[PDB]
Design a protein around this ligand. Structure first.
Ligand SMILES: COc1ccc([C@]2(C#N)CC[C@@H](C(=O)O)CC2)cc1OC1CCCC1
Ligand SMILES: [Mg+2]
Ligand SMILES: [Zn+2]
Length: 323
């Protein structure tokens, strides 16, 4: 209450603590933060989005994330939206993004894992889930999260975009689909390779601000930005990172259990009887998170040096916790 306001003073900062805000908001981190983010950015005035209409949509959306899922609940969506909101304000990207694009990125982050069941794309495919069948085994969950988020905008009471242009609604729809689809981990290497190529030919106005010529280059940076926000736990303060690490291992171990019950092959990192939580996080930083953040940092330097320091430091805490 007074605690909520104290915590939201950190809204524009990486150091924001999303657990605390959930505790001070009747367990509505995502509504809480989306509302804070949208007032902070004047998005409601700019796009003539009624306040009531926005709250009802956000509340419904949060309710569609599942509370009995360890990691992929409304707290995570709120984290990615907040992380994303800070990254959009990085100095190197200053006057680069239209208000529509900014709106699309934060909306994308908000809905990006909605209705997630606490199991991977691979599991849904191997068990012949209705979702895998619906989606022909390709970005199964990701296609689903989009389908749900765009469905909920259909009833006029929740169409936060009622007042955009037709041409504006389409461009947003195109951008959001593109960004959520890019959170699919199977596409990570392809995305990281492309990010490295964009860094190679990077250009700036002279004031250390990137020159991103039309749609292609702009959506590529937004794709990677939301993907970075989604893989941002290990760049956050250690107290936060450990709670996030603990929640993701609870989700995985539950999957390992659901896998075992059914005689399926259990995947090593989902095996509670063999998986080292610590080695597991070190591998995650070495082979996935650091290579990505190292490249993001190159693109916006030196805006993300602090983050790389924290990362390299959290990496060592986990290393030092293994014999
Ligand atoms: C804080 O630790 C983690 C946080 C998020 C993730 C995910 C990845 N990559 C799991 C997969 C998820 C997805 O594709 O649905 C995206 C997020 C994975 C994490 O760690 C994994 C499991 C243990 C080490 C690697
Ligand atoms: Mg996801
Ligand atoms: Zn996610």
């Amino acid at each position: 209450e007074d605690h909520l306001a104290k915590e939201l003073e950190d809204l524009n900062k990486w150091g924001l603590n999303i657990f605390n805000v959930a505790g001070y908001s009747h367990n509505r981190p995502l509504t809480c933060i989306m509302y804070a983010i949208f007032q902070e950015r004047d998005l409601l005035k700019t796009f003539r989005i009624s306040s009531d209409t926005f709250i009802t949509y956000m509340m419904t959306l949060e309710d569609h994330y599942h509370s009995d899922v360890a990691y992929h609940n409304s707290l995570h969506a709120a984290d990615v939206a907040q992380s994303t909101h800070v990254l959009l304000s990085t100095p190197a990207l200053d006057a680069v993004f239209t208000d529509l694009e900014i709106l699309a990125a934060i909306f994308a982050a908000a809905i990006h894992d909605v209705d997630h069941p606490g199991v991977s794309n691979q599991f849904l495919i191997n068990t012949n889930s209705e979702l895998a069948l619906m989606y022909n085994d390709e970005s199964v969950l990701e296609n689903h999260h989009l389908a749900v988020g765009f469905k909920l905008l259909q009833e006029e009471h929740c169409d936060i975009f009622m007042n955009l242009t037709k041409k504006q609604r389409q461009t947003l729809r195109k951008m959001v689909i593109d960004m959520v689809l890019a959170t699919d981990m199977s596409k990570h290497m392809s995305l990281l390779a492309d990010l490295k190529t964009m860094v190679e030919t990077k250009k700036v106005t002279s004031s250390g601000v990137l020159l991103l010529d039309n749609y292609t280059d702009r959506i590529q940076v937004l794709r990677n930005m939301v993907h970075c926000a989604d893989l941002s736990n290990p760049t956050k303060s250690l107290e936060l990172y450990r709670q996030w690490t603990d929640r993701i291992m609870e989700e995985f171990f539950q999957q390992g259990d659901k896998e075992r019950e059914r005689g399926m092959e259990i995947s090593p990192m989902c095996d509670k009887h063999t998986a080292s939580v610590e080695k597991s996080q070190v591998g995650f930083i070495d082979y996935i998170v650091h290579p990505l953040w190292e490249t993001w940092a190159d693109l916006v330097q030196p805006d993300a040096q602090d983050i790389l320091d924290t990362l390299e430091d959290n990496r060592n805490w986990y290393q030092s916790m293994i014999p």
